[PDB]
């Protein structure tokens, strides 16, 4: 079938259908992959608005949103908070105990969910997923393991293809409404 | 019909002659669409100096400005003053009431407003107004409705372009005097 | 001849020979063109490590840089120091006034004179000077006007461009000194 | 002979073999040579996260990583110290200084070293070690200077490249555990 973005194997459609969970990695994925840091201990970090979009389409759209992360930054809450994203494991050694227990909370089963990531720590829960997804500029070996590869790069509006097929999938694109924030 | 980013048609030049009114979204047409969060709350968002030439000049040659946006920040206003930019909406995702304000406070017909936009958010407006601009980036389920699409990118001068498009369709061009800050 | 950039005409080299200043223009020269702003009023401007090796080269080859800002902005005032730039005019209106101040300053000729620029703004002063530039990306009716275009875009080493070409036409490349800061 | 970002040359897979050090240029390496300097001495400076995963890679792999830096900020020690580079120079514009230091305390020889680098300020120590290794957009002249040129542009993950290559030569990629940080 036929994307705005170009089109899509019946496969990756058909799993598209049934994500139930939609989990994001923030660096390089939701972000252009770069940290931004100053002298006097400034941290900062950017987000595309457009995935902002996607997302809060699909949190109105009965997909619910997830971002598993390796230390407790509080810009990622704040724009958690800004989308309202309730579901923030941050602190995370492995990605896959954050995993087991977002499965546990939610009672939602594996193939029911999407995971989009950009390099190899990603991987191990990618697996596991119904939907795994690779940004247009992930690592190399990422890409070919990947059950889609986005044609937008990671925090340039990759998120939003993948909102925009979990809709499109699940036909309830045309219908969405979401901010551009 | 000729422009110096190319040949545009009789149409949308016929159209640009009878603006007097440029509404323009923020992200992902003022910007590349980034949100920069810092981990003390701090907010950051990039403008273009040469849009803001462009901006001058319109409003140095009888055409108004404004701004209708989903996002609130101060940032955004400091930006506007810096420009002489007197009319602006913030934290709106219903964008057809600050639009509706607008018609009503300087009297003017909606075929006489252009308006730029990236997002599906931006298209309720853009419908109804006389020459409607998706950015050569805007979300590509805009880019077939508008009736002129720019060749360059947001935040990168497609603002600029569409300053430079009304100009040369009133004549006003050639003389246009702006500050490229 | 040719160049690390691709080959030049005889006479833009000529003209090279003879430049002993070198005015540069701020924004879409030395930045990407892009102001960030923050909402408790920071600005930042981002600068190219390596047109700051490129301007060092120049200072300590016998050719003074000189910049023409239409603001104060403490920001270039700690760049210009951090690279011994110490002609620094800001706040100027006109930049004729500025480049007439500039030339009764230094006892200098408008043909030893190099400007580089990316707006039309810049057009005035460009065509007095020996050596006009127009960065690769600079307002399409400008890039037509200069007598050099530059390779490389404004705020990724256009300025470094430009000193690697006045250099070499005057002999100084291959034994020339700077610093990537 | 293959990579994952394309077929290397057999004496560069020889030369990354033996690397016991890397020492990598910060401006235009670890970042894509962007100074980000503001009104208040506010200072940023954006690095590369899966770079980041790489050198915790190298780190962990008994390959140990070194930094030479022409500026000075105290951004640049909070990075290594969240990487875990022990061995950092800083305001140091004759690099050979550094290098010399470097030997002499790790006991260490230049053939065992590799330098990433991006600029000509970067070669005189590029050249006295066993693999140099030129960013995809380094200045020209550096480019035909190196044993290698990375695929990926820096500050894009030119050094992730860099640290895949050493760790593919050793037979170490496969297991290499880092964090994207
Ligand atoms: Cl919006
Ligand atoms: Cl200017
Ligand atoms: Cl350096
Ligand atoms: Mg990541
Ligand atoms: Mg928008
Ligand atoms: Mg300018
Ligand atoms: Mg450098």
């Not at 997909?63 to 810009?75: F, P």
């Not at 809450?77 to 602190?91: F, K, M, N, P, S």
């Not at 896959?96 to 939610?106: G, M, N, V």
């Not at 009672?107 to 190899?120: K, Q, R, T």
Request: some cysteine; charged content about 25%.
């Amino acid at each position: 079938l036929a994307t705005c973005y170009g089109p899509v194997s019946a496969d990756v459609m058909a799993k598209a259908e049934n994500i139930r969970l939609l989990i994001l990695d923030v660096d390089g994925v939701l972000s252009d992959g770069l940290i931004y840091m100053g002298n006097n201990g400034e941290e900062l970090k950017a987000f595309n608005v457009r995935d902002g979009y996607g997302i809060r389409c699909a949190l109105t759209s009965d997909i619910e949103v997830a971002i598993i992360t390796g230390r407790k930054a509080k810009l990622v809450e704040d724009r958690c908070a800004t989308l309202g994203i309730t579901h923030l494991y941050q602190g995370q050694s492995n990605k896959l105990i954050a995993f087991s227990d977002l499965l546990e909370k939610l009672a939602i089963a594996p193939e029911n969910v999407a995971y989009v990531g950009d390099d190899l720590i990603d991987w191990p829960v990618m697996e596991k997923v119904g939907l795994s997804v690779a940004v247009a500029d992930a690592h190399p070996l990422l890409i070919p393991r990947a059950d889609y590869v986005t044609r937008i790069a990671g925090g340039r509006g990759a998120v939003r293809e993948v909102c925009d097929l979990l809709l499109l999938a699940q036909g309830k694109l045309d219908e969405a409404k979401g901010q551009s924030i």
